[model samples]
Target: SDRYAVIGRPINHTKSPLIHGLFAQASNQQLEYGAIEGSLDDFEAQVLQFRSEGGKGMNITAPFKLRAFELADRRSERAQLARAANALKFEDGRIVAENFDGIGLLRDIEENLGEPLRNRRVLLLGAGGAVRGALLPFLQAGPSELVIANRDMAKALALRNELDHSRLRISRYEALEGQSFDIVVNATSASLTADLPPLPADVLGEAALAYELAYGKGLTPFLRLAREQGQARLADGVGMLVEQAAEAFAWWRGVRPDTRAVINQLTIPLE
Candidate 1:
């Protein structure tokens, strides 16, 4: 069996094993996936150990993403843009890194959620890794404009400057008060703590799509407030999770499974 696993700190809550297992079963691929608690100090050794033990690939999460990016011998454009790595393949004495989060998020939002981003205004709330990884793909979606708002002005400005895309804008939370957006993406980890961002009233335009980047946290504070404000629809990150996993699986195994049934199986009611 091909061996694969997700490595991170506090990896106990990961659904990746189950997700990959279902994918393997559906595609008739023989593979084993597990979660490894990478050490807080010198996690590279842990990853290398797994590689040495006949491991085929690994999904890196959290604090190790940047490190993985740094250590990668080769990387995808998305991973390079994000300055982080989420998936790694060990091959011929080299590590290949890639970031599928952006593509996965785009598929989930446009195809699965039925909200296309073409010529629509998008407000992304965060300047962290999530937003960083996703910006290039989101910009390529042909949005009329994409704005990034963060509490730390410098970081947001830095991100905007790094990409230097004409369609990108950086702003503070207050600037979004009277403004409206076609889609508002909460890329921050605020939802993990059941906390809400500093979005003012009416920030979400009429029929706006509110997307929470945290999965398994149904009706996050951001989505809850959006619902109260009579915003359009809300979505969690589960679809993105599965989609990115599928992308990684395809890269590692060269066979992408049909993800519709898998997405449906893992989807939870937002209510």
Candidate 2:
């Protein structure tokens, strides 16, 4: 049987298997999908073993994404840009890598939430991998302007150097006062640590989507702040999680999974 799996150090919490199972049932495809906990040293070995056993593809997560890039014989443009791959497709013993993280994110906003960012000013918080993953997709949407902000001014400035500076801006968090954006995305670990970034309240303008890339928490610290500002929308990352996995699912199975049901099933309770 064709097989699929998600590989991360601590994998039990992953919803890939559940999501894929539903997809298999709906699509009438016979497939096996599961998750495997990985050690720091076993990234390549584990993947190769799975592929050798006829594993069709993999959905990569966390620290393994960088290593997944190395395993790819060919990579998608976003995977090449980020130097990371979140989905791996096996074809004739060749591992083709693609990244669906950014596209998943944009799809969550554009398709699911019906919020398109075209020509809209967007403020992206953080310069970590999540922010890096979002760069290409956000640019692809043809936003009016994109700004990368962080507490460390230098890091924020440095990120803009990696992208087309013509449409991207870099700034320290404190410089956000009197500023406004149609979308404010929180990609930083601030939400995980329960620490809010130094973003100013006025920056979230009318019709802004306060997007929290980290999910399983209803209102991340950043989203809470956005609520008090403009006509903001509160959303966790569930849709992106399911959507990205569906891309990986499609890569392996040659069929895209319907994600609306799985996304509806996933839950996050506000505390």
The CA lDDT of each predicted structure is 0.90, 0.83
Worst 10 residues of 1 by lDDT: 199-208
Query: Which residue pairs show collisions in model 1?
Result: none
lDDT of 1 by residue, 7-52 (tens): 9988998889989999999998999999999888979998889899
Q: Measured by C-alpha RMSD in angstroms, how accurate is candidate 2?
A: 1.7
lDDT of 2 by residue, 33-130 (tens): 88988779877999999989888888888879999998789998888777899888888759999999988899899999888989999888888777
lDDT, candidate 2, equals 0.83
The alpha-carbon RMSD values of the candidates against the true structure, listed in the order shown, are 1.2, 1.7
Clash pairs (backbone) in predicted model 2: none
Q: How well does each candidate superpose onto the true structure, as a TM-score?
A: 0.96, 0.94
Model 1 regions lying over 4 Å from their true place: none
Instruction: Write down the TM-score for model 2.
Output: 0.94
